[PDB]
Amino acid sequence: SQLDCNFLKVVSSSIVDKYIGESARLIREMFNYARDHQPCIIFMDEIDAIGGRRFSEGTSADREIQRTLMELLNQMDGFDTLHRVKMIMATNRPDTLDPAL
Amino acid sequence: TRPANHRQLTFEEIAKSAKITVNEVELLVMKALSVGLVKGSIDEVDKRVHMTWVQPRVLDLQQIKGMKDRLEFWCTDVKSMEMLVEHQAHDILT
Amino acid sequence: ENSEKIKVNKTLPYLVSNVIELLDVKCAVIKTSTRQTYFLPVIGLVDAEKLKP
Amino acid sequence: DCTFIRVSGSELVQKFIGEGARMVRELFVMAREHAPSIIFMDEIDSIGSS
Amino acid sequence: EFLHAQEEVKRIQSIPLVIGQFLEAVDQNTAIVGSTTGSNYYVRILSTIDRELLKPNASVALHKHSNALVDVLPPEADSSIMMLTSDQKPDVMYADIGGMDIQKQEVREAVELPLTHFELYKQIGIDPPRGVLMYGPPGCGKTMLAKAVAHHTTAAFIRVVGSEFVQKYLGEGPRMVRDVFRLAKENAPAIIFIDEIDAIATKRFDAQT
Amino acid sequence: LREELQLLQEQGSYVGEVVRAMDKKKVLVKVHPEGKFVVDVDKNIDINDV
Amino acid sequence: AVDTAEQVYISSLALLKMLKHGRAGVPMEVMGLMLGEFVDDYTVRVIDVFAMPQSGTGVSVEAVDPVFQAKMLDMLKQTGRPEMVVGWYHSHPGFGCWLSGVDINTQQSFEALSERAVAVVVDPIQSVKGKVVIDAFRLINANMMVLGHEPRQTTSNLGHLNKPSIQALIHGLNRHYYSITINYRKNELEQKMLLNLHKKSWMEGLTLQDYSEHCKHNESVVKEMLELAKNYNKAVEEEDKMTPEQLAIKNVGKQDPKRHLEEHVDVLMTSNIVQCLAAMLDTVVFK
Amino acid sequence: AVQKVVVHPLVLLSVVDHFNRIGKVGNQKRVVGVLLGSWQKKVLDVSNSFAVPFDEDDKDDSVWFLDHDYLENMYGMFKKVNARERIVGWYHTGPKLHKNDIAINELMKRYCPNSVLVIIDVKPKDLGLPTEAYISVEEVHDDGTPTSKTFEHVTSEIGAEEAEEVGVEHLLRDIKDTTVGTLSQRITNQVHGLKGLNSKLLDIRSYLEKVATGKLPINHQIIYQLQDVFNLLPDVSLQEFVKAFYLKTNDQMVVVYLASLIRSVVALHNLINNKIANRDAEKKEG
Amino acid sequence: CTKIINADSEDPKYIINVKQFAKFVVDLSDQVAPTDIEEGMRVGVDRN
Amino acid sequence: KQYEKSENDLKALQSVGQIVGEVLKQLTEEKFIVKATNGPRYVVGCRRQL
Ligand SMILES: Nc1ncnc2c1ncn2[C@@H]1O[C@H](COP(=O)(O)OP(=O)(O)OP(=O)(O)O)[C@@H](O)[C@H]1O
Numbered sequence A: 001s002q003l004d005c006n007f008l009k010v011v012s013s014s015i016v017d018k019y020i021g022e023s024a025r026l027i028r029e030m031f032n033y034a035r036d037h038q039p040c041i042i043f044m045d046e047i048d049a050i051g052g053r054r055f056s057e058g059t060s061a062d063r064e065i066q067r068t069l070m071e072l073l074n075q076m077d078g079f080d081t082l083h084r085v086k087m088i089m090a091t092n093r094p095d096t097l098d099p100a101l
Numbered sequence B: 001t002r003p004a005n006h007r008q009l010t011f012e013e014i015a016k017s018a019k020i021t022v023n024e025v026e027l028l029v030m031k032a033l034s035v036g037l038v039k040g041s042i043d044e045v046d047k048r049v050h051m052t053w054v055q056p057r058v059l060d061l062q063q064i065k066g067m068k069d070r071l072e073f074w075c076t077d078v079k080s081m082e083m084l085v086e087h088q089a090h091d092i093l094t
Numbered sequence C: 001e002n003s004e005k006i007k008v009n010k011t012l013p014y015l016v017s018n019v020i021e022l023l024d025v026k027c028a029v030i031k032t033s034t035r036q037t038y039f040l041p042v043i044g045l046v047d048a049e050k051l052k053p
Numbered sequence D: 001d002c003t004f005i006r007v008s009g010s011e012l013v014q015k016f017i018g019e020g021a022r023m024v025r026e027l028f029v030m031a032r033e034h035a036p037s038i039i040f041m042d043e044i045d046s047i048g049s050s
Numbered sequence E: 001e002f003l004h005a006q007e008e009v010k011r012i013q014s015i016p017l018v019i020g021q022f023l024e025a026v027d028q029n030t031a032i033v034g035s036t037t038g039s040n041y042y043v044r045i046l047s048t049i050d051r052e053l054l055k056p057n058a059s060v061a062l063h064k065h066s067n068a069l070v071d072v073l074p075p076e077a078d079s080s081i082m083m084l085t086s087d088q089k090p091d092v093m094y095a096d097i098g099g100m101d102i103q104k105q106e107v108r109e110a111v112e113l114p115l116t117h118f119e120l121y122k123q124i125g126i127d128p129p130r131g132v133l134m135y136g137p138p139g140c141g142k143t144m145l146a147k148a149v150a151h152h153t154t155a156a157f158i159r160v161v162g163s164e165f166v167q168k169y170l171g172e173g174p175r176m177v178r179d180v181f182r183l184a185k186e187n188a189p190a191i192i193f194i195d196e197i198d199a200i201a202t203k204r205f206d207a208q209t
Numbered sequence F: 001l002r003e004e005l006q007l008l009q010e011q012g013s014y015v016g017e018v019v020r021a022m023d024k025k026k027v028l029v030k031v032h033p034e035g036k037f038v039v040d041v042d043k044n045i046d047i048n049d050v
Numbered sequence G: 001a002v003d004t005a006e007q008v009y010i011s012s013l014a015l016l017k018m019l020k021h022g023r024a025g026v027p028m029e030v031m032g033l034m035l036g037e038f039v040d041d042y043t044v045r046v047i048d049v050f051a052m053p054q055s056g057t058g059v060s061v062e063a064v065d066p067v068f069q070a071k072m073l074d075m076l077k078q079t080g081r082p083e084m085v086v087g088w089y090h091s092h093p094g095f096g097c098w099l100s101g102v103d104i105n106t107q108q109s110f111e112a113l114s115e116r117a118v119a120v121v122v123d124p125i126q127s128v129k130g131k132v133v134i135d136a137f138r139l140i141n142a143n144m145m146v147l148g149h150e151p152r153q154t155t156s157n158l159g160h161l162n163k164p165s166i167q168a169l170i171h172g173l174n175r176h177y178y179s180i181t182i183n184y185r186k187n188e189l190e191q192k193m194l195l196n197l198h199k200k201s202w203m204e205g206l207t208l209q210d211y212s213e214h215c216k217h218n219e220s221v222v223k224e225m226l227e228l229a230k231n232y233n234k235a236v237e238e239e240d241k242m243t244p245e246q247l248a249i250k251n252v253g254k255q256d257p258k259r260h261l262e263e264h265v266d267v268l269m270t271s272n273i274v275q276c277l278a279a280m281l282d283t284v285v286f287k
Numbered sequence H: 001a002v003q004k005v006v007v008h009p010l011v012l013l014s015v016v017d018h019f020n021r022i023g024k025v026g027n028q029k030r031v032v033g034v035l036l037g038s039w040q041k042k043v044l045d046v047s048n049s050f051a052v053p054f055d056e057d058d059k060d061d062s063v064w065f066l067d068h069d070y071l072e073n074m075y076g077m078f079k080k081v082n083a084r085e086r087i088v089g090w091y092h093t094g095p096k097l098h099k100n101d102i103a104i105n106e107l108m109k110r111y112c113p114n115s116v117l118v119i120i121d122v123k124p125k126d127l128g129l130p131t132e133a134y135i136s137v138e139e140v141h142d143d144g145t146p147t148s149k150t151f152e153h154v155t156s157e158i159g160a161e162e163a164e165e166v167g168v169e170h171l172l173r174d175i176k177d178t179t180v181g182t183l184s185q186r187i188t189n190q191v192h193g194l195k196g197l198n199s200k201l202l203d204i205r206s207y208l209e210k211v212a213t214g215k216l217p218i219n220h221q222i223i224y225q226l227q228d229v230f231n232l233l234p235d236v237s238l239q240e241f242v243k244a245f246y247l248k249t250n251d252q253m254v255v256v257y258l259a260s261l262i263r264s265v266v267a268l269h270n271l272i273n274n275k276i277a278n279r280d281a282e283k284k285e286g
Numbered sequence I: 001c002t003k004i005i006n007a008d009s010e011d012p013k014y015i016i017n018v019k020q021f022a023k024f025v026v027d028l029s030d031q032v033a034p035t036d037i038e039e040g041m042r043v044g045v046d047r048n
Numbered sequence J: 001k002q003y004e005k006s007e008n009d010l011k012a013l014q015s016v017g018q019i020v021g022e023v024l025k026q027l028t029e030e031k032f033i034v035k036a037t038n039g040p041r042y043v044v045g046c047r048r049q050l
C-alpha cells in the first residue's frame, strides 16, 4: 500500500497440473508481466509446495516439480538482471528447501 | 556606404565618424549587435570590425538608378553564359 | 435527413460476433463467427459504456 | 557412389496424430525412387524402444 | 524502353507481399511453392533471384494476385528470435569477478580466444575445443562468469534455460532443439549458453511411463 | 524483358494430385484443400498422363 | 443494320473520376453514371461522369435514384453543358471485369430505354502499377442464336486491344455480352499541363546537396568496387578451357565481370559531374 | 495561418474543361467556381470542385454575380454523395486578376471563415507557373497609412495520392520525363532551371524600371526587402579559393582514376574476347 | 439451408447459423408469411 | 444535442475496420515480418511516424 504498484498474489499450488510444460510457462509469464510494469512486488505464499529439494528418483511427478523449481530458481537470478522487481516468499514449513533457493 | 567589397571597417573610422574614443567602440558595436540592427563580428588582432548586415531602409530614388545598373550587369551575366552552356552541350542535351 | 441517411446504410443482413475486450485509446477487438479477429477504432451505433465483453 | 539418406530419427514425431507416421511411408518411396539407396538411423534409443 | 522495363520489373516487388515457403522446382524459371494460406500453388518465378537459394526449402515472398515468386527471404530470419543485442546485454565487465584466475583463463581458451586468434590453433593444428561444462556448489560465480563472456564477445549470443524446451505437445520439445542449432549454424560464429541442464541430463535406463 | 513482364502479370496455376483418373478426355482431380473435380485436358498433352 | 467493331471515347476528366471514386469506397462496390453523346453509328464518346449515393442494396436498378437523377441533370444544364446519359459503371474489387447476374438486369433496363447504353467495369485494387483494368461491354440478344453473335464486319482491328481473357470468358462472354474497344480522347493543353505540373522543379535544378553526404557517397561506392574489382581479377586470370562458352553460361548470376562492373562506374560518373558542373556555374552566375 | 495548399490534379483539370464548356460562347475570359476542400492542418488539401454561373462587366468592375442558390443545392449534392468533403474556397483564371476579388472573397467568407482562393493559368502554361494561391488578411496597411485589403500569398504545390498517379502514369505514355535521370536529364534541369532565373529577374527588372523611372507610386515594403538580397550574395576570397580547389580536386580524383581507367579495361577486355572469337571461327570455317 | 436460433416480435430480426460459415442476423424474403418460420427449422437462404 | 449525436454517427459510419496481427521480426528499416491471428505471414511498412 505504501507507494504501491502492480502487486501480485500467487498461492503456489494452483500452478501445477497434469501437462508437463505449463508450470514453467506460468512462471515465465508472471515474470514477463513484472518486467512490463517496472515497479512490482511478487508475492508467493507456501513455497514448500514447489520449493522442495532435489533427489534421485521420484520418477512420475517429482521430475516435473524440480523442473518447475529450476525455472523459478533461475529466472529471478537468471541471465537477465531482474530490475526494479521485489519478491516476498512466505511459507510456514521451511525445513526442507533447496539451498540454491 | 561601401557595398560589402571591403566591409571590414577599421576602428578608427568609427572613432572619426562617431567622434567617440577608441575604448568605447567595442561596447558601441556590441550594443548594436545586441539590439539586432547588425549581425557582424569583431576581430581585435587587427581591431577591425567585420560586417554582415540585415537592417535595410529607404534608398532614395536616385539610388534606385544605381540599383538598376547592378541588376542589369547581374542580368547579362546570367543570360550570356547560359548561352555558352547551351551551345557547348547542344549535341547531348536533346 | 441524417436519420434517413443512417437508415439506408444501417441495413440487414448482419454478421454476428463476440466482443473479446474493450479499450478506449471506445476501442474494441472483435472476433467474428467466421473465426476472424478484427479491430475497429470507432465502435458505432451503440455506446461503449453500454457494452461488455 | 549411391543415394544416401540421413535420418536422425526423432524428426518423425511432429505434433499430429497421423503426420509423424505417414512420412515413414513417404520416406521409403523416396528411397525407392533413387532405387539403390542406404538409409541411416541416428540413435535408436528413441522411437523403437519397447 | 529498356529503362521503362527495369523500372516496372523493380516496382513489382515493393508491395505488401505474402509469405509462403518454397517447395519444389520444375525447371528453369517455373516452380512449385506452397503458401502460408494453405492451398499449394504452381507459379512462374523471376529471373532476378540466383537459383542457389531454393534448396528444397526457403521462406519466399509472393505477389497477391499474380502469385509468382518475387523474393527469397534471408534464411531463418525469425524461427525462435533469440539475439541478445544492446539492452539486453550484460550489465557486467570482465574484471568485475574477483579471484577466478585459473577459471577465467580456461573459459577464455575455449570461447573467447579461437574467435580472434584462430591462426594460433591453425599453426599447431589443434581443432580448438567445442564445449564446456561448469559445475560447483551454488552461488560461486557461474552465471556471473557467463555474463562476462557475453560482454566482451563479438559473436551472436543465445541464452537458453534448460526447461522451456520441454513442453506441451508431442514432439514439440525436440523441434525447439532443432530451432536453436539451425539458428546458430545459419548465423556467425556463435555462442549458445544453455542454463542448468540437469533437467534434461539424467541417464535413463528404461522408463515404464 | 517485355516477355517476362507480361507473363508475370498472370494469375498462377493450381496444383492437384492424380494417382489415377478415368479416361475419355476428362480426368478427376482433387486439388489441395478442396474436393474433387471432373476437368478437361489441354490439347498439348495426352490422355496418357496417368 | 447491325453492330460492328465500334469505338468508345472516354475523356481524361472521366477516368480520374472513375478510379478515385472506386478507390474511395474500396470494400463496397461504388456506383455512378456515365454522361456523353452518341455521335454516330459505331463510335461513341463520353465527356463527363458523376457518382451516385450508395444504397443498402448495392449495384442494381434500385440504387439508381430518379430524383437524384433529374436534379443532378438540371444543375448541369445551365453550368457546363447538358447532354444525354450514355451508360453507367460500377466497381468490382475482388475480380477483374465481368457482368454479374444483377449487373445483367440493370443493363436490360438501360438498353431498353437508351440506344446501346455501354456499361463499364473498373477494378480499383487491381489497377495499381502502370496499367488499368477497365473494360466496357454491351449486352447481346438471344434472337441471333442461329446467326453470328458479335456481328462484326469489314475491319482488322478486332484482334487487337485484348484477346478475350480466360477469367472473363468463363462468365457471360461471349454468349451474353460482348467486349468493346477503348481509346482516349487525348489532347494537347491537357497533356502538357498534366505533364509539366505534376513533375517539375525550378530552383531545385541548381542546388547542391552539398558535400557532407555527396563526398561521403564517393566513399560509399568505391569500397565494394575495390572488392568487386578483385572478383573481376579472379575470373579473368582464371581463363581455362572448360569449354568456355559453357563456362560462361553455367555461371550467369547477375554478377561480376560486366554486370556488377561499370554500372557503378556510371553512377560515380553521373553524380560527380552534375555536382561539380553545378558548382562551377554558381561561381559564374553569382558574382 | 496556412502553410501550403495541395492541388489534387482533378480540380485544375476540372477547371480547364469548364473553360472549354463556355468557350463555344466564350466572351467572359474568366471562369469562377467553387473550390471544395479538406482542411487537415496548417497545410491545406483540395481534391474536388465544381463551377457556378458568374458574370462581370468591364465598366465600373463592381457588378458581379455569384449564385448563392446554385451554390447551396449542388454542394448539398456533393455532401450527400460524399460527406468527407466540404468547401474551402473558390477559383478563377486570367492572371491579370480583376480588382473585384475583394468583393467575391468577402461575400463567401460566410461559408468558410479562413477562405482561400487559387488562380489557375489555363492559357499561360509555358515557363514556370503551375498555379497561384492567395490568402485574405486585412491590416490597415502599415503604421501611418490608410486602410486597405492587401491579399497575401501562401505558397502552393501539386499533390499526388494513389489511384490518381495510376490515372497519371497511364495517360502520359510518350516521354514521361523518365525516372531517375541520366547525364542529359540533369543538364536540362540546369538549363531550364536557369532559363527561369533571368525570367524571374526580367520581371523584377521591369518593376524597378517602371517604379523608379517614375510612373506608379512606390511601395516602401518591397524596396528594402529587395535591398538585403544584394547585401547577401557571396563574393570570391582566398578562403573561397583554396577551399574550392581542395574539394573540386577531391571530386575529380573519383572520376579520373577510378572511372576512366576501369571503363577502359572492361572495353579492353571486349577487344580480346572479340578477336579470339573472331579468328577462331575464321580459321575453323574450312 | 440453415437453422434458426430464435426470432423477435412485430419485426423479424431473425438469428440464423450456417454454422459452417458464420451466424447471421437476417430477414425473410417477400415470398413467405412470418408464421411458419419457427425456431429450429430448415429454411432457404439467399446467397448474397 | 441531438444533432451532435447524428454528426458523431456520420463520423462513425465512415471507418473501415482493421486486421489484428503480431510482429515476428524486422528485416530492414521499412520491411517487417508480421503475421495475422489466423492467416498467413506478410511484409509491411509503417504509416509515417509510428
Ligand atoms: N568472485 C566473485 N566476485 C564478485 N561477486 C561474486 C563472486 N562470486 C559470486 N559473486 C556474487 O554471487 C552472486 C551469484 O553469482 P552466480 O549466479 O554466478 O552464482 P551461481 O553459482 O551461478 O549460482 P547458481 O549456480 O545458483 O546460478 C552474483 O550476483 C555475484 O554478485
Ligand SMILES: [Mg+2]
Residues within 6 Å of the ligand: A074, A077, A078, E142, E143
Ligand atoms: Mg545462475
Ligand SMILES: [Zn+2]
Residues within 6 Å of the ligand: G059, G090, G092, G099, G100, G102, G103
Ligand atoms: Zn456488378
